[PDB]
């Protein structure tokens, strides 16, 4: 359960990170 | 806890991308 929260927490930012990324790729 | 899952990814996405404003900023 704890590492339930770390591992969504952590991945859910990492495409999210991307996300805006792809944007910024997609706006450049 | 479902405020926090909302509270820590909406601070998370606007932080970075206001971050990812502040480097269009830099490169500016």
Same mark, same amino acid.
């Given at each position: 359960? &704890?590492? =339930? #929260? =770390? #591992?969504?927490? %952590? @991945? @859910? &930012? $990492? $495409?999210? &990170?991307? $996300? !805006? &990324? =792809? %944007?910024? =790729?997609? !706006?450049?």
């Amino acid at each position: 359960q &704890e590492a =339930l #929260s =770390l #591992s969504v927490n %952590e @991945g @859910g &930012e $990492r $495409r999210m &990170e991307m $996300r !805006q &990324e =792809l %944007e910024q =790729l997609k !706006q450049k």
